[PDB]
Structure 1
């Protein structure tokens, strides 16, 4: 008799449980945290609010938190990212979950509220795990009193980390935060290699288009852009890369990509004459990876080659001007999360019109929207950092401090490199890799300890 949840179909739990059991065999660092911390229950008494894509991998993270003594209430941070069998398996385990694939904006905010409100009253939560900063924002603005009982926040992705650093700069951050994103076992694993695996995966599932030999334009060459570009180049695409950062643009050149701008001389003045129409007219696929706003604007969408694929893999859908296409062009749904955007007009469309674009996931996270996001063995590194971060702040008990000590402890920090290396060692062991041990003469030679850390904090890997 348990009802504190809402999912798409609860009869999918058995299917979800089967994939969770498989996923656990793929997540040795996360499962390793279960064995190491089960006896001590480091999260005994923790009441975590979690907002992150309700996938099979999140389910293993959720149950790792529960198995260490934490009670949780969960929702997804994107309307399309939920795997309905995962949410059913979590709901069947008696865990409050409110998520399903294909939510509306109303139901998205409603699901976040159900994590905040237990029986119409704010839940006595003391921890926050967020992915993107949506939950962090609603708490800071609509329920400020609840932050006086919270010991910290653990933010997953780059976008949310920036929103936190804006509050630490404006002094509006109430509880300290752990930058989970900037762990190397997260940033240079999740963001890069994760998109390398799931970008072409999502494009194949959505369109079944051959990618080899076609022209692609990747907007951005950060960690997501590096992996996305590799995701396409290893399929045989001719990949071009756009950047505003000259350093990231230099890496693209050395990595074998031609660096181009959508605008003549790189100057985006908002006009049609600025668009490199010749370049945009040969592009078969464009992927936005910036986390910025309107990096695939209307004039770019108007100049795109007919029947080009448009998708976003940054956190928010405002990287593409989907609002422009909703206002001016008619959408023909091919299937869930696949739409043909007929550039002929808004008042209907010809079914055999050749001048259309193909938008995936309505501009949302395409890897989670049109597929299943990152594989379990990669999310293993991300969520092992998340579990360690939840402990690293719960054991510090920020909320129990006087105001004078709170000011000196308030910050946004990454985990120490020692934790980062420990997660990495468990991931390497999952591949059967054998790490070499330094001899005492060698550790002295390079001035490190045999047990690490092996790099100064300034090292970039």
Structure 2
């Protein structure tokens, strides 16, 4: 089983989760509690699930990504007492039903991936809301949705946004999301990136990482944006900025990373050159309008696994990766094992934080406590065998005084 092998592989390179398991498996702090999860299911996230289980939690999972009927990772999890609900295709109806099945187990805590499970809890299953003590949300898209929910006054449980900690800087780095995205694009196209015009839509944490990686690969990077401050940063970073309607005319690759909808229009698409490659790095598959592609294409064909060709009225053919879905997850390895280990440790401690403090907390979206960022950093340094400096007594006094040393 590649799946059991992959879980064993992953476990060997997730030192933080291993440390957490070794530290708390005997005390089992989550014993008697149920953690529900909506996540992209594969070996890495399976290990998060397993760690929570070792800590005593009853884990209930729903995988958003379609899985083969005898998926090795799902089976490994089930053999450990972990419940796993999956779907076979991108059928929204089944996806909704699977979310409901997780809620049917009345989770005490939820680890959400985009805010779906939380939102549906507040709009369709209020009975579950009463037992729900807290939510840990991973993505920028999910946090945005939940902050908007809080805005209306409808939010009824504490939410910890793990997304915006001191270390989202690690997750979206050029070595985090940046490289995983380009690895998925290159492995599925075998095309040379050096010298090519790469358009990246959005220059936030995700897009910047993707743009920096492309440049490091020799690409000529072009950035599109709606925020002047971000555009200027791209320019200062050495990239070219222009409107998308202009960028598409010269694009060899177009990568969306905005977290917005319809970043490409029909007109935009009809400007692309024959052979152009499109991919989405945002959370939902609405950035590149796949429905529009389907509708205006004279013909659609499979060019390679994970790559769809679309010939248009202008006779040109453009290619889409992973049907416009999160390319690094849907057609790649997601993020490096050690990067997920870091993200997962933050999420596990967030859940423990909610367990210890949900009553004291209010039904609003909280930033991840600083103490958690520092605890994970200290553990990471320990696992690396790295030592750093400490402040001296004189330095402590210097830093808090306004008077001059002299």
Q: Under a length normalisation based on structure 2, what TM-score does the superposition of the two structures give?
A: 0.92
> Is residue 188 of structure 1 aligned with residue 172 of structure 2?
no
CA 1:99 to 1:227, structure 2 compared with 1: closer, same or farther past 3 Å?
A: farther
Contact 1:129 1:154 in 2 (8 A): yes
The aligned runs of 1:15-414 (5 Å cut-off) are 15-79=2-66, 84-99=71-86, 102-116=89-103, 122-185=104-167, 187-192=168-173, 193-262=175-244, 275-276=245-246, 279-329=247-297, 330-344=299-313, 355-398=316-359, 409-414=362-367
Contact 1:196/1:229 (8 A) holds in 2 = yes
SS in structure 1 opposite 2:147? Answer: helix
Q: Deviations over 1:371-421 (max 9, x none)?
A: 1211110011111111011111112243xxxxxx7xx72221122212102
Counterpart of 1:443 in structure 2 is: 396
In 1, distance between residues paired with 2:351 and 2:204?
Answer: 27
Q: Aligned pair in 2 of structure 1 residues 428, 253: CA closer, same or farther (>3 Å)?
A: farther
- Mapped partners of 2:392, 2:86: distance in 1: 51
CA apart distance, 1:103: 3.8
Asked if structure 1 preserves the Cα contact closer than 8 Å seen for 2:64 and 2:86, the reply is no
Match of 2:374 among 421, 440, 459: 421
Shift of 1:60: 1.1
How far 1:261 sits from its partner (Å)?
Answer: 1.7
How far residue 432 of structure 1 moved from its aligned partner, in angstroms, is: 4.8
Deviations, residues 255-296 of structure 1 (Å, cap 9, x unaligned): 22112222xxxxxxxxxxxx32xx422110000001011112
Aligned residues: 399
Structure 2 residue ranges without an equivalent (≥5): 402-406
Q: CA offsets per residue over residues 226-264 of structure 1, 9 Å max, x none? A: 1111221111111111112222222212222112222xx
For the Cα contact (< 8 Å) 1:242–1:249, is it kept in 2?
yes
Cα distance in 1, alignment partners of residues 22 and 252 from structure 2: 48
SS of residue matched to 1:43: coil
Q: Is the 8 A contact 1:151 1:397 kept in 2?
A: yes
Name structure 1 gaps, 5 residues minimum: 1-13, 117-121, 263-274, 346-352, 399-404, 449-461
State the TM-score, normalized to the length of structure 1.
0.81
Change (3 A) 1:204 1:429: farther
Once residues 91 and 184 of structure 1 are traced to their aligned partners in structure 2, the CA distance between those partners, rounded to angstroms, is 35
Q: Is the 8 A contact 1:77 1:131 kept in 2?
A: no
RMSD, aligned CA? 2.3
CA distance in 1: counterparts of 2:118 and 2:69, whole angstroms? 20
User: CA 1:83–1:188 in 2, change beyond 3 Å: closer, same or farther?
Assistant: farther
**Structure 1 ranges of 4+ moved more than 6 A:** 80-83
Q: Residues 332 and 341 of structure 1 are in contact (CA less than 8 Å); yes or no, is this contact kept in structure 2?
A: yes
The one-character-per-residue Cα deviations of 1:302-350 (angstroms, maximum 9, x if unpaired) are: 11111111010100111111111111212201244210011148xxxxx
Contact 1:46 1:394 in 2 (8 A): no
